[PDB]
From Swiss-Prot:
Acts as a sulfur carrier required for 2-thiolation of mcm(5)S(2)U at tRNA wobble positions of cytosolic tRNA(Lys), tRNA(Glu) and tRNA(Gln). Serves as sulfur donor in tRNA 2-thiolation reaction by being thiocarboxylated (-COSH) at its C-terminus by MOCS3. The sulfur is then transferred to tRNA to form 2-thiolation of mcm(5)S(2)U. Also acts as a ubiquitin-like protein (UBL) that is covalently conjugated via an isopeptide bond to lysine residues of target proteins such as MOCS3, ATPBD3, CTU2, USP15 and CAS. This is Ubiquitin-related modifier 1. It is found in: Cytoplasm. The lineage of its organism: Eukaryota, Metazoa, Chordata, Craniata, Vertebrata. Pathway: tRNA modification; 5-methoxycarbonylmethyl-2-thiouridine-tRNA biosynthesis. The modification 1-thioglycine is found at G108. Component of a complex at least composed of URM1, CTU2/NCS2 and CTU1/ATPBD3. Keywords: Cytoplasm, Isopeptide bond, tRNA processing, Ubl conjugation pathway.
Length: 114
């Protein structure tokens, strides 16, 4: 089947930034340039995870995120706006969109010595 259809969306780019501690899980960097591929369907947070969990995320996911969704501690923010109000997984990233990922769970702190 040649010359079937034509119209493959183009690759979108998004600026991902992680607070303190999480950045380490990603080449230890404050800002990370992401470039998602192009397809018939727009890159939605749901999928985005799979990428940021593999492509970006260099360390074990179970540590940063668990599953297609962000851990119960990792708070994300799309364009300075809780992804909750927009769309935890319903949102569909288009382009020039900046995604923030902060970690407020891994805070090993208890019995002090010094």
């Amino acid at each position: 089947g040649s010359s079937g259809s034509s119209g493959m969306a183009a690759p979108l780019c998004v600026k991902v930034e992680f607070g303190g501690g999480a950045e380490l899980l990603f080449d230890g960097v404050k800002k990370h340039q992401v470039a998602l591929p192009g397809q018939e369907e727009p890159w939605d947070i749901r999928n985005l995870l799979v990428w940021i969990k593999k492509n970006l995320l260099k360390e074990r996911p179970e540590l940063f995120i668990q599953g297609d969704s962000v851990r119960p501690g990792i708070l994300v923010l799309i364009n300075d706006a809780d992804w909750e109000l927009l769309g935890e997984l319903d949102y569909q990233l288009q382009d020039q969109d900046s995604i923030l990922f902060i970690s407020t769970l891994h805070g090993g702190s208890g019995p002090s010595s010094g």
